[PDB]
């Protein structure tokens, strides 16, 4: 559903370098007598929360980024785009074929030969793009550079600034420590950053009923805090379904190209080759997929290392490549043709998301040789992708017990050269199906605290079945707090502000504000009556009005001078005064100011 | 509700030193062709899960411990027990007075003068009681001493044994590192241990409708894993309600004596004195309350230290003592009469649970001077209580960000001399009301991993309202996994066994077993059809049947000898063999054994 998020309001901040920009937020005003500024919150929901914008899925979200991508003059319009083929939708026809999105008036772009295109390429060129200033404003949460907040935490050697400037964003991208998944063909996108030195982001998974039901999956997820969304659709209508998704997505769209590639060859893993895969890549690039999960780490001699595992290979896309490597006994062609993949993704600025094909499916299989062999392989591929100018982030576990979480983070930073980490959890235990959104939340907060850039969410009933509309919301909210719990522990400038604002709300009995500042206001406002008086009782501690602290005198006397107690002190009589004033003021610990 | 827990069966193990004992568990049998022993699980649910025992709340659970407490010959029957007074139930009469429990045929015991009574006193005397062997059997999970499991984890210097012997239990109690909350007047109790070197325990809170509805709160909580239960009932009928609870409780019952004491004096905190409090103590001791939460740490000069807090004093019982200390300006009488309190609790073997009166209610107020001042005070009181022969455990936060969790654990171990830790969470963030069962689960697992003995649960909608019947179950399950996630990380002998059993269950497609081993089988079995064939597909990795590993030869050749690749290797031709056999066997990664 759409409409303004309960208890909040969509607000924007314009750009300085790029006055065209309108960075989105949602503010939550507090009670007038609280004397506090409104609380600014990160908002990936997009134009669906803005009551000033009418969204028609048959038309798609307005391409507010397109005007500035062309303005760079590095992109050109593809004279002959790639027409949709029968196998793109699983050879579906007639009434069984998904409704084609009217993408008639949408220009498809490709980089001009010789010209720079990717954010990484711009960054290393000393160029600050529109997207870089966009995420800079967004990361500061509309907070003044003149007024920071005293941060208190442990980021384990991270380089988190007090204020995110567009120049700072460029530098993080320049050294591959942060990425901005922004395909040139995704004009509907509201740019976001992914890095250890920024806010922790989360991902919500959707995929394939009516296409409107699939678009609603996208809207529902992003409404409640999902930063990026992946279309893990399989089977038929993969192409047409994803058309409606990307056109109506303000958040970065992720895919696993081997999914659709496998369907074009009728689920026969050995029928996969470079020919079909290259076609799938270009197909999704011209649609505007911001990042591909490519399992180019699953090398042939890594397969026997999984023979001793308890749950074996649990990655779908990773097991596909495994089955392929067993049928031909030729090296992973995503690895052998990795150079050519980079040349394609660079032309459209598609970010790399190196897959966790050999990730642990149980706590027993965690941190085994098979997992780390792939991990160190991704680090080598990261350098190869970096040298082609393609943005990179690494994917990780999985099912990991807490005492091994730190080990995973250490290996990643060393071997993947501080590239943004992307984790599915991890799940700290395997014994709680139906509550795996909580078992993974424990691990997600920990490794997010250790320095993970983005966290892929885990639905409650994940090892039980498909998630319903309420479990998706449960998953997003659960991972939004886990990301924030990590932000709070890392001492990110703008985390405690939210914590303290709602804490003072409870303290001053400002009920409406306490419910509006809640991570899930819809649930919190269920206990709110909008007709009741919006009160704001500002009080002060009784002892704060006590001058000389008589209680300190007496205790500092009975320890050093037990002889001075045989007489009415100036402290003892002073305490009798406070007892008098306390009871006279109504025997209240917190006396009201107003 | 009662009845056998879904997918499991109540099993017992007899005692060696005490053949009368019947230590309770619930086993979960796996598929016959899996060739695995049944999985033994900790079960605090009591006789309500045993279909061989008819439970009548009007009669109460059978006192199966009573026969062995009297057998020690240290206790005597109180000739004149304490009759229930009007103020015990808040001066309620007629139809507004709760139904009195028919406690006619229940002998009330008190320690004989000069004789030992508490488990600590027995332990330091070199005595192994019936309760000590009871918890030893229970902690081993019916596992053979001949067959341990290779444990892998980090307990931060804990002394966790491979096998819990009754002698080991005594030693932990002897040094105050573990306790067994076992009042002599709680014969219905199935003994349990609380310590860092044992399984992590959890607590569920109940309190005051029909008394049967309150007993159902107790049954519901313990059914799903609650180790101890506290009756935080307030207002009227506090006495009579708690009568039905303790008589029908196989788990240790906890209370906060200042709650009922405050009601006897009509909610006027300043009307509280030693006279009323001593009466309340003896009242609850003769009922069989296993441990009291006493806020004897809230000293008078600690109150002004809370003046700078964001949320101030959030502890109910702790704020009561604060208001009292402001009205008289005399030191906390629970602190000044602490010696006399110990003399009462020792006579009935009531364990100490030193309250967290000045615990943080927000992440901002975490680890402030007010909190730690009380904490170090409890450590001094712990020594005083220890020297009276009273079992002690310490209570902690609260609302703490992850980077401060370790600091809390370090202060506790040092100043409270490795006494069992009892924590309300902690909540890692303050921005997610309605999901505070998850925000606290992150902190509960972490500090439980660091070495917390017991974790007080936090209901989902805790900062929103009262928990319903489903939120209680949600809370218990959430904290049962958080406790296990901590057990798994600490590498407790018997944690990975559960994790691995359910992991092999998923791997061998043994669906029924996967659902039965789930922490919440009732939810997991919802996706289970009992009519479908109970299959058990045991398979093996294809590469495990590969002899010389041709994939290793080829990769170890192309790195050292690129010249040897211009010819069909014995490895290249051997890989063509495996490709052949792989496709001939059905192109399956995991070939079936049967
Ligand atoms: S003397 Fe009384 S009022 Fe003054 S600081 Fe101490 S407790 Fe507070
Ligand atoms: S040669 Fe083929 S079958 Fe043998 S170990 Fe390597 S991958 Fe497995």
Short mmCIF file of N, CA, C and O in Angstrom, two decimals, chain B residues 3 7 71 90 100 142 192 230 299 301 319 358 381 392 420 532 544 563 577:
data_model
loop_
_atom_site.label_atom_id
_atom_site.label_comp_id
_atom_site.label_asym_id
_atom_site.label_seq_id
_atom_site.Cartn_x
_atom_site.Cartn_y
_atom_site.Cartn_z
N UNK B 3 -0.72 -31.53 27.91
CA UNK B 3 -0.47 -32.56 26.92
C UNK B 3 0.98 -32.57 26.46
O UNK B 3 1.69 -31.58 26.63
N UNK B 7 5.57 -33.59 18.76
CA UNK B 7 6.73 -34.21 18.16
C UNK B 7 7.74 -34.75 19.15
O UNK B 7 8.82 -35.21 18.76
N UNK B 71 14.22 -36.00 54.50
CA UNK B 71 15.15 -37.12 54.66
C UNK B 71 16.52 -36.66 55.14
O UNK B 71 17.25 -37.43 55.77
N UNK B 90 -4.64 -7.38 49.93
CA UNK B 90 -5.06 -6.01 49.69
C UNK B 90 -6.41 -5.68 50.28
O UNK B 90 -7.18 -4.91 49.70
N UNK B 100 -9.23 -19.11 48.00
CA UNK B 100 -8.13 -19.63 48.80
C UNK B 100 -7.79 -21.06 48.37
O UNK B 100 -8.67 -21.90 48.22
N UNK B 142 21.03 -36.43 29.38
CA UNK B 142 20.94 -37.88 29.20
C UNK B 142 22.01 -38.41 28.25
O UNK B 142 21.84 -39.45 27.61
N UNK B 192 16.85 -27.05 39.31
CA UNK B 192 17.63 -26.59 38.17
C UNK B 192 18.80 -25.74 38.65
O UNK B 192 18.74 -25.13 39.72
N UNK B 230 8.66 -15.64 37.49
CA UNK B 230 8.45 -14.68 38.57
C UNK B 230 7.00 -14.21 38.62
O UNK B 230 6.41 -13.87 37.59
N UNK B 299 21.28 2.77 47.44
CA UNK B 299 21.68 3.58 48.59
C UNK B 299 21.30 5.04 48.39
O UNK B 299 21.17 5.50 47.25
N UNK B 301 22.88 8.06 48.79
CA UNK B 301 23.66 9.01 48.00
C UNK B 301 23.81 8.63 46.52
O UNK B 301 24.50 9.34 45.78
N UNK B 319 12.61 2.32 42.20
CA UNK B 319 12.10 3.67 42.34
C UNK B 319 11.32 3.81 43.64
O UNK B 319 11.27 4.89 44.24
N UNK B 358 18.93 0.62 39.93
CA UNK B 358 19.41 1.74 39.14
C UNK B 358 19.87 1.29 37.75
O UNK B 358 20.87 1.79 37.24
N UNK B 381 27.51 -6.76 49.22
CA UNK B 381 26.37 -7.44 49.83
C UNK B 381 26.42 -8.94 49.54
O UNK B 381 25.98 -9.75 50.36
N UNK B 392 23.43 -16.60 46.23
CA UNK B 392 23.32 -15.27 45.63
C UNK B 392 23.45 -15.28 44.11
O UNK B 392 24.27 -16.02 43.55
N UNK B 420 26.47 -15.73 39.74
CA UNK B 420 25.59 -15.88 38.58
C UNK B 420 24.92 -14.57 38.17
O UNK B 420 24.35 -13.88 39.02
N UNK B 532 1.64 -37.94 4.82
CA UNK B 532 2.71 -38.09 3.83
C UNK B 532 3.76 -39.08 4.31
O UNK B 532 3.99 -39.21 5.52
N UNK B 544 33.26 -37.40 -3.37
CA UNK B 544 33.75 -38.28 -2.32
C UNK B 544 34.07 -39.66 -2.87
O UNK B 544 34.86 -40.41 -2.30
N UNK B 563 53.35 -25.73 -19.71
CA UNK B 563 53.80 -26.40 -20.93
C UNK B 563 53.20 -27.80 -21.04
O UNK B 563 53.09 -28.34 -22.14
N UNK B 577 36.28 -38.83 -17.54
CA UNK B 577 35.67 -40.02 -16.96
C UNK B 577 34.62 -39.65 -15.93
O UNK B 577 33.53 -40.23 -15.90
#
